[PDB]
Amino acid sequence: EVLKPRTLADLIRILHQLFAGDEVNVEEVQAIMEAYESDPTEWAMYAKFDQYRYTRNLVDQGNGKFNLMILCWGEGHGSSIHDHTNSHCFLKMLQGNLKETLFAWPDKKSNEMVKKSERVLRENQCAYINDSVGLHRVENISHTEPAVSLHLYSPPFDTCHAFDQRTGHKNKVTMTFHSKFGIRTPN
């Protein structure tokens, strides 16, 4: 049981099949992403780090059905609290560990945001989120080692909202790619 990709290339091929249609079986995609055993030799071309902030590195555009990308988290790097613009979002660890904090959605009223769950993603683990699940923040647990994660978003999206933990107020954020297909972007 569970089709096991032996390479990152196998995984991409399978994903093209699983997203070719109208339905997407979330638990099936998750298990297959989790079954791929992270191999740094295969994804090192995408692992382009920045001193001050995590980077987004596009791997594959999934024939318009999804975006597959690798996020590189320096020592102590973390994300804002954010949503996912009504898409599916899968997150798989490739190296290190991320702490995921799930938050409830704010009301129109201003106050402190509420944590709904907290966990550390294990080696090779694939997590899943969408807007109905909640909001989340993700961060490198380590101040001495990096983390690397593989993200799949379907449909693709290039804007989301970031939330202020103190008030729940949000701002629209346009995300950019640090590199695409192993090639640094103009910035």
Binding-site members for Fe cation are: 82, 84, 136
Query: Residues within the annotated binding site?
Result: 82, 84, 136
How big is the chain, counted in residues? 187
136's tokens: 């989340």
Q: How far apart are CA 175 and CA 166, in angstroms?
A: 23
Q: Of the candidates 96, 182, 87, which has an alpha carbon nearest to the alpha carbon of residue 138?
A: 96
Who's near 84: CB < 8 A, 6+ residues apart? 129, 130, 131, 153, 157, 160
Residue 150's closest CA among 90, 82, 80? 90
CB atoms within 10 A of CB 2: 8
As separate numbers, helices (DSSP H) first and strands (DSSP E) second, the chain gives: 3, 13
Helix, strand, coil percentages (3-state) for the chain, rounded to 5, are 15, 35, 45
